Design a protein around this nucleic acid. Structure first.
Ligand SMILES: Nc1ncnc2c1ncn2[C@@H]1O[C@H](COP(=O)(O)OP(=O)(O)O)[C@@H](O)[C@H]1O
Ligand code: ALF
Ligand SMILES: [Mg+2]
Length: 426
DNA sequence: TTTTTT
């Protein structure tokens, strides 16, 4: 039983073939309105998002899954690493509209990599292969994570590190609408404080509403979720729950060469009945995708049985990761698998990073924000909850947790003064 | 520091 704000009506006919970027405060109804348009579109829509949890929340898959995109940045001079199977092309030409939720965490070059890969399959110079595309997200929440060495690599090509700095907006553009009804939260004394943490204009008197969060009793269990700034805090929290007793350890097996730096899974996956888990890969067959959460019910020597948040029981077998590297063969340069690891594609999920929690909704969260470092990271971390009564904090909410990004004010200025559009018009 | 492939 959902409301359609007057703004939501204003969008829809704009699409029936210009592109559109829809933004608005945390819990303004972006991710739900998105779900509703996939029905009322008449177009074959394919849904993807930068991270698996947000993707699961929106219906679809990660952007790297969808477009077979390797991890590192991709320049105009870099060669496309991966080719598409004939299924994934079927998926992409049959696609009429592409969606992207939590667009704010998407690097500029991802879009250009998606641009190039789509122009290639549609055999056209149309931007994106002439595929209408609509973007959901919010710039004043989390930006894309990049690692500085990656950043200078793209400073050679990009005047900025946000999704709108994609070079294909030199060949096309999008409209911009701001949904303005915050649904998820109801107390305005609350709501007013986050809108201000969002736009960097909050005062230490409004921050004194958030005094209650410091040091409240754990009413569990209905149990709490822990969302953190760093994985260090994540791994400790879940080891703290779960505990040392009644445990089953499952060790990774690693064929040859695969450095512990980039093993994408748990080395020693320790679990007990009733442990809260997340799945890390996609298996269409069984139906698990990377982001879904479950509850573990049956641990045998080689199969882990877990019942998902959606309801269906899965039997997890182990999954194998391959370390493909580039090497020299009979005077040929070729990606040869130099190793492999094999664990169950599961990890503990009583605690997740604030990054993985963007897009989600909760009734009782626990936040660990004493060491924030990204703009809008605090803002995401405490806008997840419907009510304040339901949030705990590891430290007081100080203004040192708010980090403004002035690239974002300029971007609003640019589009708000030019009729809510951005990029080349046609 | 934070995420992410077929
Ligand atoms: N149109 C709506 N009418 C009523 N409640 C809504 C609406 N949209 C969202 N909500 C409530 O807010 C929650 C989160 O909204 P969501 O769409 O996830 O926000 P975001 O735009 O930040 O993704 C939903 O789970 C629902 O409880
Ligand atoms: F952008 Al959201 F919950 F999807 F804040
Ligand atoms: Mg969303």
């Amino acid at each position: 039983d959902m409301i359609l704000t007057e703004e939501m009506q204003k969008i829809m006919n704009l699409i029936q073939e210009n592109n559109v970027f829809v933004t608005g405060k945390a819990g303004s109804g972006k991710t739900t309105f998105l779900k509703y348009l996939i029905e009322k579109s008449g177009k074959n829509c394919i849904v993807a998002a930068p991270t698996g949890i947000a993707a699961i929340n929106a219906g679809g898959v990660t952007l790297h899954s969808l477009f077979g995109i390797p991890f590192g940045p991709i320049t105009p001079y870099d060669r496309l690493e991966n080719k598409f199977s004939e299924y994934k092309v079927e998926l992409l030409l049959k696609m009429e509209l592409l969606i992207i939720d939590e667009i704010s965490m998407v690097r500029p070059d991802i879009l250009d990599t998606i641009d190039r890969k789509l122009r290639w399959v549609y055999e056209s110079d149309e931007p994106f292969g002439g595929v209408q595309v609509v973007m959901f997200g919010d710039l004043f929440q989390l930006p894309p994570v990049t690692k500085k060495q990656e950043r200078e690599i793209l400073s050679d090509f990009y005047d900025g590190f946000f999704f709108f700095n994609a070079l294909v907006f030199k060949r096309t553009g999008f409209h911009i609408v701001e949904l303005t009804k915050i649904f998820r939260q109801t107390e305005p004394e609350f709501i007013n404080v986050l809108n201000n943490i969002r736009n960097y204009q909050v005062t230490s008197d409004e921050l004194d509403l958030l005094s209650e969060l410091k040091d409240r009793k754990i009413s569990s269990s209905n149990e709490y979720i822990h969302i953190c700034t760093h994985k260090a805090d994540v791994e400790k929290i879940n080891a703290d729950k779960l505990g040392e007793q009644e445990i089953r350890n499952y060790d990774i097996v690693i064929k040859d060469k695969f450095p512990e730096s980039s093993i994408p899974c748990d080395l020693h996956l320790k679990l007990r009945v009733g442990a809260r888990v997340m799945s890390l890969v996609n298996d269409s067959l069984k139906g698990y995708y990377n982001g879904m959460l479950g509850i573990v019910t049956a641990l045998e020597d080689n199969v882990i049985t877990v019942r998902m948040d959606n309801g269906r029981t899965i039997k997890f077998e182990r999954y194998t990761w391959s370390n493909t590297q580039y090497t020299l063969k009979d005077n040929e340069i070729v990606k040869e698998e130099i190793g492999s690891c094999t664990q169950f594609p599961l990890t503990l999920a009583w605690a997740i990073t604030i990054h993985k929690s963007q897009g989600l909704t909760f009734d009782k969260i626990i936040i660990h924000v004493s060491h924030t470092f990204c703009p809008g990271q605090l803002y995401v971390a405490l806008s997840r909850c419907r009510t304040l009564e339901g949030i705990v904090s590891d430290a007081f909410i100080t203004k040192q947790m708010i980090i403004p990004e002035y690239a974002l004010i300029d971007f609003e200025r640019a589009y708000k003064s030019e009729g809510n559009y951005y990029g080349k018009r046609l």
